[PDB]
């Protein structure tokens, strides 16, 4: 077909034009801008708590907005809300499907969400209407496994699925209000902007897309990774984000410059990144790895600052408290560790 | 600070209740063998078992089995297959009557090879079901389809001396069966160390002994892992 041939020709011409436009803005690199900045030094965090009680491996955790409570999901079919200060378990929610792959805590603290190989995102009412915790709403639109979910607020949640789509939900109606399409592979993670007006998603096509929540369209597409992107997180400023992929590298992309700023990799690292997160100031990039450690990276320089080596199996999730007080890591050894 | 002490006491009581429930949950979890039923759409696994994932529970010799069949998922598996690293066994169902009808047998071989060599699945055993034995037998007896057309090594392949065939079986049917089985076992033994094992099984889509085969294979897997914990094997 000549129509398909000329459409592909136009697409590659547009890609070349975009590449030229991005190249013209690369007057200098971030590495040489922050060359005179003093190094962060050596970061040595100790394990302060070890949360035990999960029977199987843990895929997801999410810190509460109060920086004290967190929720974790394990393949045994359990959601546990922990009191990280006292290591006491607050709730232990049995799941209808044991193949959970993600969990989200609501910013208000009234709800938790989970999903997985069953394509349903389940919302749980934490606050005691009568005393117990039960399923509040099930969202069954997706045709693939649920990989990530994040509450915009109460009654709004964004979910990424293996059907290569992201969706925006209304909890009371249970219906999708917006569908975000354009990824050609499984969407593995999403991160909400601080203002909750935009969110980025990393997929198995080695691409990250910046979406508009209100308009439901892809504003920008970021490339540069070589394998499936497993993790994504905004810089605390909101004008940048970091990704972690199976190609054993972490990359920092700038929204306004519309390109890559820095790559975080070492020759001794040949395993993929499963989770990334920033510190409170964004100076440190924390990445979990297929090998059982976590690496602390300088954000403004491409040099490692410290290592979190406490886990006996794959590190599957990590997160930093809203106040930056501590970082928690989940792992396939069925333990959560609080680092400080 | 008495209010703080009361809150701590209440939190401790709630934690104690949660741990007491978790003990029973752990006891239930350890006494159940989870199984991942995997195969092609026309491999016959739909009759064998007779929503993102389907679930069926069957009890054999008072032992609980929990077998999961993957439903509404895309054909890309490299991400959600990692959820079954700690499963007791992966039941792989292959249509033996597909060496020509789209080389489906080669696709099944590639899928098995990918499962075998995956880093997160390098400790999970595979119960292999070479299904549709009657259809393969009738196709071999008919002679219309030649296996050597799509597997050139079949011409120079001889039935193994340890092969035990059924009484009323054509030697050609037995040779084809064991050729497919050895095609799978070549991948199984190429890099399959003592961590995980393969259990070939010439089965029909409707066999009353399939649950017995699964039970025996799971018992063997558990016994082997126990013996390896003691470094006896």
């Amino acid at each position, epitope marked *: 077909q000549s129509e398909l041939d000329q459409l592909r020709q136009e697409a590659e011409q547009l890609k070349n034009q975009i*590449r030229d436009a991005r190249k013209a803005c690369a007057d200098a690199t971030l590495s040489q801008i922050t060359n005179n900045i003093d190094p962060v030094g050596r970061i040595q965090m100790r394990t302060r708590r070890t949360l035990r009680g999960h029977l199987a491996k843990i895929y997801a955790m999410h810190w509460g907005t109060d920086s004290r409570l967190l929720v974790s999901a394990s393949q045994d079919g359990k959601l546990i809300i922990w009191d990280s200060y006292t290591t006491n378990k607050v709730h232990a929610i049995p799941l209808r499907s044991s193949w959970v792959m993600t969990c989200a805590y609501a910013p208000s603290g009234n709800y938790v969400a989970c999903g997985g190989l069953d394509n349903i995102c389940s919302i749980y009412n934490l606050k005691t209407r009568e005393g117990n915790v039960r399923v509040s709403r099930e969202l069954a639109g997706h045709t693939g496994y649920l990989s990530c979910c994040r509450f915009l607020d109460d009654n709004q949640i964004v979910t990424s699925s293996g059907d290569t789509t992201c969706a925006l939900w209304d909890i009371e109606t249970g219906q999708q209000t917006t569908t975000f399409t354009g990824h050609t592979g499984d969407v593995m993670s999403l991160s909400l902007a601080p203002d909750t007006r935009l969110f980025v998603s990393g997929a198995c096509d080695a691409s990250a897309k910046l979406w508009d929540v209100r308009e439901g369209m892809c504003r920008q597409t970021f490339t540069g990774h070589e*394998s499936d992107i497993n993790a994504i997180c905004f810089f605390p400023n909101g004008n940048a984000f970091a990704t972690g992929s199976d190609d054993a590298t972490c990359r920092l992309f700038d929204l306004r410059a519309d390109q890559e700023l820095m790559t975080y990799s070492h020759d001794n690292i*040949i395993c993929g990144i499963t989770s990334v997160s920033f510190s409170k100031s964004g100076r440190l990039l924390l990445a979990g790895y297929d090998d059982f450690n976590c690496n602390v990276w300088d954000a403004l320089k491409a040099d490692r600052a410290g290592v979190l080596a406490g886990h006996d199996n794959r590190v599957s999730c990590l997160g930093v408290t809203d106040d930056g007080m501590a970082v928690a890591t989940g792992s396939w050894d069925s333990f959560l560790k609080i680092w400080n | 600070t008495e209010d703080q002490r009361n809150e701590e006491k209440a939190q401790r009581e709630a934690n104690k209740k949660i741990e007491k429930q978790l003990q029973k949950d752990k006891q239930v979890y350890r006494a159940t063998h989870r199984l991942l039923l995997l195969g092609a759409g026309e491999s016959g696994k739909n009759t064998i078992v007779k929503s993102g994932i389907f679930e069926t529970k069957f009890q054999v010799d008072k032992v609980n089995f929990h077998m999961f069949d993957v439903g509404a998922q*895309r*054909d*890309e598996r490299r991400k959600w297959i990692q959820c079954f690293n700690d499963v007791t066994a992966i039941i792989f169902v292959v249509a033996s009557s597909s060496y020509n009808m789209t080389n489906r047998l080669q696709a099944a071989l590639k899928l098995f090879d990918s499962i*075998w060599n*995956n880093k997160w699945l390098r400790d999970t055993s595979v119960i292999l079901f070479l299904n549709k034995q009657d259809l393969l037998a009738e196709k071999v007896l008919a002679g219309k389809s030649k296996i050597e*057309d799509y597997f*050139p090594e079949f011409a120079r392949y001889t039935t193994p001396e340890d092969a035990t065939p059924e009484p009323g079986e054509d030697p050609r049917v037995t040779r084809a069966k064991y050729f497919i089985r050895d095609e799978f076992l070549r991948i199984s033994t190429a890099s399959g160390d003592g961590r995980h094992y393969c259990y070939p099984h010439f089965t029909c889509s409707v066999d009353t002994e399939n649950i017995r085969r699964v039970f025996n294979d799971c018992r063997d897997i558990i016994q082997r892992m126990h013996l390896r914990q003691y470094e006896l094997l």
Partner: nanobody, 128 residues
């Protein structure tokens, strides 16, 4: 941007010879295992051949064994497929597909209907 452009296909007589090349960019070529996948008209994607990172481990499908020769050049970031004895059943669109992850031995989803890390394809037609 991971790009794979394959060129070399075209009309060829039965028993003829064709050479398929695959120019790769956007990733470290030497770290990945390459594959060749074809789609016959009216049928699904069928795996053909693969070659390891160093090129010391080569596998073929039975239909083309002894006829096709896969080869890779890590310095030039190029993947090759030599065709020697073409048949009318060899008429298909041939795709240059890359394994999802580096340094791995398993190669999942390489023949998926909508699978990234695969080229647009080059048409090979065998007729008279």
């Amino acid at each position: 941007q991971v790009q794979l452009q394959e060129s070399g296909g075209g009309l060829v007589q039965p028993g003829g010879s064709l050479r398929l090349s695959c120019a790769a960019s956007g990733f470290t070529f030497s770290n990945y295992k390459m594959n060749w996948v074809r789609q016959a008209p009216g049928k699904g994607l069928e795996w053909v051949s693969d070659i390891s990172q160093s090129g010391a481990s080569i596998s073929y499908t039975g239909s083309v064994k002894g006829r096709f020769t896969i080869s890779r050049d890590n310095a030039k970031n190029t993947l090759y497929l030599q065709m020697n004895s073409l048949k009318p059943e060899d008429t298909a669109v041939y795709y240059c597909a890359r394994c999802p992850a580096p340094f791995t031995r398993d190669c999942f989803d390489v023949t998926s209907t909508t699978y990234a890390y695969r080229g647009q394809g080059t048409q090979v037609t065998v007729s008279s």
